[PDB]
Amino acid sequence: DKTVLDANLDPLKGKTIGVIGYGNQGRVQATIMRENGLNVIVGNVKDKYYELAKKEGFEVYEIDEAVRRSDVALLLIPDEVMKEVYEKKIAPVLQGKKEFVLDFASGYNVAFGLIRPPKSVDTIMVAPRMVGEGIMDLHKQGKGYPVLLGVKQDASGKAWDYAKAIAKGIGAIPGGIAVISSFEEEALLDLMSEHTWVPILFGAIKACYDIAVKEYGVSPEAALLEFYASGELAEIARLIAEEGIFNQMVHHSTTSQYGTLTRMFKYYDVVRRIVENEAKYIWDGSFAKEWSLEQQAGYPVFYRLWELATQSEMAKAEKELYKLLGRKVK
Amino acid sequence: KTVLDANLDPLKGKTIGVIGYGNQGRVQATIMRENGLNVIVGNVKDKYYELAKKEGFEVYEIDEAVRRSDVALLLIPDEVMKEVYEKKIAPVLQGKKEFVLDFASGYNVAFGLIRPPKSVDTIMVAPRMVGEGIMDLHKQGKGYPVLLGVKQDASGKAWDYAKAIAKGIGAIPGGIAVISSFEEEALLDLMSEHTWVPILFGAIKACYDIAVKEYGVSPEAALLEFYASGELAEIARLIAEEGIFNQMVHHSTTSQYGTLTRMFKYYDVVRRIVENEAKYIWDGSFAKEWSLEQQAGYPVFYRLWELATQSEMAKAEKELYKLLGRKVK
Amino acid sequence: KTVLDANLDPLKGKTIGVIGYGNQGRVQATIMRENGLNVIVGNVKDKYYELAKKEGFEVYEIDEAVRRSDVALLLIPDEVMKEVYEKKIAPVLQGKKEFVLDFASGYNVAFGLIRPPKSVDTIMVAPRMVGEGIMDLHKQGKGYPVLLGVKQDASGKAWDYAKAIAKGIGAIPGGIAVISSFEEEALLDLMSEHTWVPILFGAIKACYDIAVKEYGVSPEAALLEFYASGELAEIARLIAEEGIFNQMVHHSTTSQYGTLTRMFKYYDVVRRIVENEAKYIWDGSFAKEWSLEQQAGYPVFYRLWELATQSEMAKAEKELYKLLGRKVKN
Amino acid sequence: KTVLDANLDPLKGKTIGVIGYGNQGRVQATIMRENGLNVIVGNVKDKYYELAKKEGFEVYEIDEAVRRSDVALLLIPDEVMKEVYEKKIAPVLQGKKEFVLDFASGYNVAFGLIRPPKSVDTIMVAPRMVGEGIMDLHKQGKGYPVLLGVKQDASGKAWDYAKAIAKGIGAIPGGIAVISSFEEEALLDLMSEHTWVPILFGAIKACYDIAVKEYGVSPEAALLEFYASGELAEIARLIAEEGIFNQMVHHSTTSQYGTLTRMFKYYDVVRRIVENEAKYIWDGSFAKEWSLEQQAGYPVFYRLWELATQSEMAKAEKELYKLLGRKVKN
Ligand SMILES: NC(=O)C1=CN([C@@H]2O[C@H](COP(=O)(O)OP(=O)(O)OC[C@H]3O[C@@H](n4cnc5c(N)ncnc54)[C@H](OP(=O)(O)O)[C@@H]3O)[C@@H](O)[C@H]2O)C=CC1
Ligand SMILES: NC(=O)C1=CN([C@@H]2O[C@H](COP(=O)(O)OP(=O)(O)OC[C@H]3O[C@@H](n4cnc5c(N)ncnc54)[C@H](OP(=O)(O)O)[C@@H]3O)[C@@H](O)[C@H]2O)C=CC1
Ligand SMILES: NC(=O)C1=CN([C@@H]2O[C@H](COP(=O)(O)OP(=O)(O)OC[C@H]3O[C@@H](n4cnc5c(N)ncnc54)[C@H](OP(=O)(O)O)[C@@H]3O)[C@@H](O)[C@H]2O)C=CC1
Ligand SMILES: NC(=O)C1=CN([C@@H]2O[C@H](COP(=O)(O)OP(=O)(O)OC[C@H]3O[C@@H](n4cnc5c(N)ncnc54)[C@H](OP(=O)(O)O)[C@@H]3O)[C@@H](O)[C@H]2O)C=CC1
Ligand SMILES: O=C(O)C1(C(=O)O)CC1
Ligand SMILES: O=C(O)C1(C(=O)O)CC1
Ligand SMILES: O=C(O)C1(C(=O)O)CC1
Ligand SMILES: O=C(O)C1(C(=O)O)CC1
Ligand SMILES: O=C(O)C1(C(=O)O)CC1
Ligand SMILES: O=C(O)C1(C(=O)O)CC1
Numbered sequence A: 001d002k003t004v005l006d007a008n009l010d011p012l013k014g015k016t017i018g019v020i021g022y023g024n025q026g027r028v029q030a031t032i033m034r035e036n037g038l039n040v041i042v043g044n045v046k047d048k049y050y051e052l053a054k055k056e057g058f059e060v061y062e063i064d065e066a067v068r069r070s071d072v073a074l075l076l077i078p079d080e081v082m083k084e085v086y087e088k089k090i091a092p093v094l095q096g097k098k099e100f101v102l103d104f105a106s107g108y109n110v111a112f113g114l115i116r117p118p119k120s121v122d123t124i125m126v127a128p129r130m131v132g133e134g135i136m137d138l139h140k141q142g143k144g145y146p147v148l149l150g151v152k153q154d155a156s157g158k159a160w161d162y163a164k165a166i167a168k169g170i171g172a173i174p175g176g177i178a179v180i181s182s183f184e185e186e187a188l189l190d191l192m193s194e195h196t197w198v199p200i201l202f203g204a205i206k207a208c209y210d211i212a213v214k215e216y217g218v219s220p221e222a223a224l225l226e227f228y229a230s231g232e233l234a235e236i237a238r239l240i241a242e243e244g245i246f247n248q249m250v251h252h253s254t255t256s257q258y259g260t261l262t263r264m265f266k267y268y269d270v271v272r273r274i275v276e277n278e279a280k281y282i283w284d285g286s287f288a289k290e291w292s293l294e295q296q297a298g299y300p301v302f303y304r305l306w307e308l309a310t311q312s313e314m315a316k317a318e319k320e321l322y323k324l325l326g327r328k329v330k
Numbered sequence B: 001k002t003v004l005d006a007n008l009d010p011l012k013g014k015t016i017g018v019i020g021y022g023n024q025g026r027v028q029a030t031i032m033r034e035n036g037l038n039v040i041v042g043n044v045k046d047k048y049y050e051l052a053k054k055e056g057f058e059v060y061e062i063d064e065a066v067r068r069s070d071v072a073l074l075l076i077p078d079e080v081m082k083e084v085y086e087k088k089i090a091p092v093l094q095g096k097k098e099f100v101l102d103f104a105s106g107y108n109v110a111f112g113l114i115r116p117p118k119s120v121d122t123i124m125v126a127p128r129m130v131g132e133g134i135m136d137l138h139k140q141g142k143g144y145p146v147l148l149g150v151k152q153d154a155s156g157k158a159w160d161y162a163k164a165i166a167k168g169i170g171a172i173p174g175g176i177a178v179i180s181s182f183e184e185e186a187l188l189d190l191m192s193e194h195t196w197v198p199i200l201f202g203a204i205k206a207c208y209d210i211a212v213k214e215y216g217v218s219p220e221a222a223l224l225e226f227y228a229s230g231e232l233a234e235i236a237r238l239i240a241e242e243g244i245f246n247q248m249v250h251h252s253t254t255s256q257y258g259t260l261t262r263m264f265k266y267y268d269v270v271r272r273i274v275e276n277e278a279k280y281i282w283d284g285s286f287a288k289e290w291s292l293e294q295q296a297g298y299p300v301f302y303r304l305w306e307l308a309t310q311s312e313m314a315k316a317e318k319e320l321y322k323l324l325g326r327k328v329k
Numbered sequence C, D: 001k002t003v004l005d006a007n008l009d010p011l012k013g014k015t016i017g018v019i020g021y022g023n024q025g026r027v028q029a030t031i032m033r034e035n036g037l038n039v040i041v042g043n044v045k046d047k048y049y050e051l052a053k054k055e056g057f058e059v060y061e062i063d064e065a066v067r068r069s070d071v072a073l074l075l076i077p078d079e080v081m082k083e084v085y086e087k088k089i090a091p092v093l094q095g096k097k098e099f100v101l102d103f104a105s106g107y108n109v110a111f112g113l114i115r116p117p118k119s120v121d122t123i124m125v126a127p128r129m130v131g132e133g134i135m136d137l138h139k140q141g142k143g144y145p146v147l148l149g150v151k152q153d154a155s156g157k158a159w160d161y162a163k164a165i166a167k168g169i170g171a172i173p174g175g176i177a178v179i180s181s182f183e184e185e186a187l188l189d190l191m192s193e194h195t196w197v198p199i200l201f202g203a204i205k206a207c208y209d210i211a212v213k214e215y216g217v218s219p220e221a222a223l224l225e226f227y228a229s230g231e232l233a234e235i236a237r238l239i240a241e242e243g244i245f246n247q248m249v250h251h252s253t254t255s256q257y258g259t260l261t262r263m264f265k266y267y268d269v270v271r272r273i274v275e276n277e278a279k280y281i282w283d284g285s286f287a288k289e290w291s292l293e294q295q296a297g298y299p300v301f302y303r304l305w306e307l308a309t310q311s312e313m314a315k316a317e318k319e320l321y322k323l324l325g326r327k328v329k330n
């Protein structure tokens, strides 16, 4: 229903695009838009990334200089420090604008109300659902990739004619898929993966090791070679991506199939209660209050939990094994 | 403990017979063919025989391979090793005054489903690898890990065989080889297929069923974030080659902080899950669950593919790939 | 939705192979011979054969019969069908190019105990009827209900057969036919024999064990009120004729008020009894319970008669029938 | 294990910069000037300066002092050390090639609130003493205990400094010095101010609130038995001289038996109180609780003073001291 695959590039012919940020994002969406023939500029603080970006012909300006030069901008800076740069530099300028847009990449700072643009402005979202550099490994092929789209304010009548038209210029369409969503759904799916099935994976290996070694008499050097020092995860995911999450398992054996399914439906009702509680804790914005306060205090907890992980009983006896193998490692 | 090398000299004058020619047969066979070792093959005559007839091997019947040789590698599955030991092979091994029997994975020994005689030496060589990449890793000359173990020894040299085998299947020198048992491997090679495999698939199934049903989300987008992307295919490449707690410097703090605060918040539940799942295996209460299913007709095994492959998630995933250009089943 | 009629020509010009001649075999058999149709009768040779040879039918052996015919009605139980498909029939069915295998109870398909090949059609025709009365009804001319379903179709005409068979077994036109699956066939045909059958027998056993041993009642009277009378037939005949909430006007309000006030007071308990009993069947965790019992020697099945048939209730029941003149136990 | 002595030459030939002149600054300061050592005294100028200029010391401003010297003893609280490192000092320390920063309480390091650079050594020297009695002890000649630790070393001599400092502050030889970390420094220094301090004050508050309001007791007597007398000091002086399980022979059996029978009856409850109170510190979930309070305006710390100082106990205590002649509240 909401599938979107093609859209014209005609609105932007005659409009300036101001890229913001030149991190490991800006070098991708800007370049794919440069060799697609659109007058585009760049804005950053001056560091190694400007000197790099000075070696590429880009018309780098200061930030507030670009955002009075241009017509639209792709605010490709992290979800951490977009608040300071909108509050301090940019937003006192946008009242000097009357026909303008502000294209975001991660809506953590909109759906939770941390930033509030005015009403004479259009806001949109263009989120690559892709690692970001693999795009450059793929865009040469002419095969695009998925994106996401959304709107907060449309005080110009043509928010969608911009958003649908942007994705055609960053190598996403025609050739891939473009999906229609909001910011409120953008931040949830972007967060619920970083809260629910990521740590519960790392939380099990930590407890399939702490049970195999300290209780059941197992060699530490072997316990890791079965969990996550082999090509299991490195190729379980490639198969899930290209075949089907419930269609790869014919490749494995029945002893691997039967034990999986009998225990997947046996624990669907105790990760449900983990996720329901972890989504209500985000839908209500009770995570921004947790993460926005940590930046004020000095990162006191974020500093400790690295020193428990990186000094535990697993990493200690893992760090030696890679020394006994010869990997590229700490 | 670790072994990193051992001479191939015990196995210059004895016959190796590999059984099975499947995902693992060709690779431990071919590598030992190019390493100067008179080796043979034994199987039923089928499509895997036919190319194996096109490869110069002495592909023979099973019990003829085992009156011929004194050593063999029984690379057949953990399911139907029992039928072939009780029926075809084991009545022969009484007629072998000395022999060695090299298993691959010890699901059929540590649980006592098979019991070789006492005039025999049992050993173990388990590739901890994907299986096919080993051949690409034989050409390179970079080996891979293995596991070793013993059930019964009546030669004083159960180890000089096992250590010396792994030198000849492209595992060492260049990789390592770790010392374990059958009892320890059938746990690690099962407790992965019980604990962190399903609880992964059990969360996506409930991070979707909560997003579409209760929170008003597009189905086509819910899949593009979880596991239809390039994400999952490279968070493993980094965990494998950098460190499970050292990839995270690449992500941002919004991705690091939410992870760690919730990993230590749930270590006391997946611990409580795995304790139950290990006691349900250490006591052999899984072989009784899996050996009975084979005897009934696979009745539960047949249903649970029919729920997974007809659920609310796969229905809308099976179509999104049609909107990308990938196959369907 | 609702089927009422279909042709009969898709089966004319073709042979039908009746398998089994039990208390259901003869019914669908004779009705199709009374309709003038070339049908054969495959069986093992016992008293049912010598009977079945006195009835004019042609008998061949099973693997000869299913070869001779074009479709067959495998009217053998759900218990020893697995042995006869595995041993005799199924090695023959690869020697055919179009064929059908008409089942009666799909307990042996939906649970995957049998798996027919790819070049074959599978269907279901379940008489939802007493079975014996159908002969008492074919001498009347009014049909009866059936059920229909498909497991696989490789002819494009899995339905023009199934819809057409039911007209030939005295079910339509005049009754109806309902469209379902095998997966729904076994559930409804099992949820009755798990949920409201035993809970009925489980209450009488506990309305007797409470009236005699705790409240001082004559045993000869406790049975005359529960189930020594035909009053249940006057609840069943009326429920079949009038309506399960319309047979109660015929009773009095003292019988209505106590019923309804307690039907809704316990709907929230038999719900939980049934939810557990349906999840224990949908997942196939009953075939594993019933297919193992056959393999052990029927050890539990043998005991539970000797508790029922030697209990406190049947003892004092078996004598009261001797004190009436009904069939005391053979 | 147990340190008892070390050299003093690694600091001779190098200046020492005393920061802070509080009730701890003067002590380690004067003892090092009494030992004939070139030391300076960096401070803000207040009554502690004018004092500190009357004592002969050289005062410079902070960023002038820490520039002048080679090492410094940052004897300022754990509360406003973050502001002075962030604002003044730390931008200077990149202009040095070898330096040391000797702390006193590692609440501001182990919780990551401060992060010194890579070209710097960090150490810990914690007086485990009242602090004022050290001057009463330096006029005696007997030293006292300390603690030692390291956060980073880039000289190979993080220990020949730390071991050597403690000899210069009247701690060794004659006392001892113990080897620990910052992470253990803050825990033991906090677990005492969380666990056995309040549970003491929490019992007297509930041995008074039960004796007066429920069991009919004179308020003027309930205090004279608990803590109006020096009997606590007669329990503390003896525990320091004799042994925490050897001060009890001096008491009677009625005082011995009731103690021990109830110490082991409640060891399994204060265990659970402390396990929760240590996991709430090891994870740094206290700095997030204390660093936020400073930002809001101290709203809770103002209230909980007004409940204690207006309670039912202090009211009738503040008058009894007026009825004795001790320091009634200022
Ligand atoms: N796994 C991941 O982390 C992935 C994230 N993404 C998204 O893709 C993009 C990632 O590109 P990446 O290159 O990783 O971004 P980086 O963080 O790598 O670079 C950030 C950019 O912002 C500038 N910058 C950083 N901090 C500040 C600051 N405090 N004040 C001002 N400017 C600052 C940087 O330096 P200068 O200004 O000198 O250039 C640079 O241009 C982001 O939008 C991210 O959300 C999507 C997929 C993968
Ligand atoms: N899954 C993996 O990647 C890993 C596998 N292993 C172990 O190695 C072995 C691999 O098993 P798998 O890869 O499944 O082998 P395959 O299923 O890949 O091939 C099966 C082989 O066994 C023969 N075979 C199959 N069924 C029968 C039977 N019923 N009777 C007789 N012969 C039969 C086949 O035909 P023919 O007889 O004509 O050859 C073929 O040679 C297992 O022991 C497994 O534990 C080790 C590490 C990981
Ligand atoms: N209970 C009912 O009223 C209902 C019945 N049905 C279905 O109709 C069928 C009725 O089965 P049922 O009534 O039990 O049949 P019967 O028990 O009435 O008669 C059994 C038939 O099967 C043959 N037979 C029995 N055991 C074997 C065996 N071990 N090997 C070979 N042949 C055997 C018998 O002998 P021979 O082969 O010599 O004839 C006879 O023909 C079932 O599928 C049931 O689900 C449908 C609706 C309700
Ligand atoms: N309190 C105790 O029971 C003991 C504490 N300690 C430890 O030793 C140190 C003692 O701290 P404390 O005794 O509280 O020091 P004091 O409170 O005794 O004196 C405070 C010192 O710091 C300076 N100062 C106070 N506030 C500020 C400020 N906001 N900005 C700049 N300078 C300031 C004061 O004025 P100026 O700068 O003008 O001198 C003075 O020199 C801490 O590290 C503590 O952990 C050691 C033993 C016992
Ligand atoms: O915000 C994040 O961390 C991303 C994710 O969805 O994983 C990259 C966008
Ligand atoms: O079938 C199994 O047991 C294997 C596993 O991955 O655990 C392949 C070896
Ligand atoms: O035996 C069975 O399964 C039947 C039932 O009534 O449930 C007769 C069909
Ligand atoms: O037998 C019945 O149904 C009666 C009732 O109304 O309770 C006694 C008449
Ligand atoms: O810093 C603290 O909190 C101290 C304590 O009372 O334990 C003074 C040392
Ligand atoms: O106050 C006490 O503890 C005494 C006792 O005998 O218990 C008087 C000494």
Ligand SMILES: [Mg+2]
Pocket: A190, A191, A194, B254, B255
């Ligand atoms: Mg994210």
Ligand SMILES: [Mg+2]
Pocket: A190, A193, A194, B231
């Ligand atoms: Mg993610």
Ligand SMILES: [Mg+2]
Pocket: A255, A256, B189, B190, B193
């Ligand atoms: Mg496995």
Ligand SMILES: [Mg+2]
Pocket: A226, A232, B189, B192, B193
């Ligand atoms: Mg595995």
Ligand SMILES: [Mg+2]
Pocket: C189, C190, C193
């Ligand atoms: Mg039934």
Ligand SMILES: [Mg+2]
Pocket: C189, C192, C193
């Ligand atoms: Mg029924």
Ligand SMILES: [Mg+2]
Pocket: D189, D190, D193
């Ligand atoms: Mg303290």
Ligand SMILES: [Mg+2]
Pocket: D192, D193
């Ligand atoms: Mg203290």
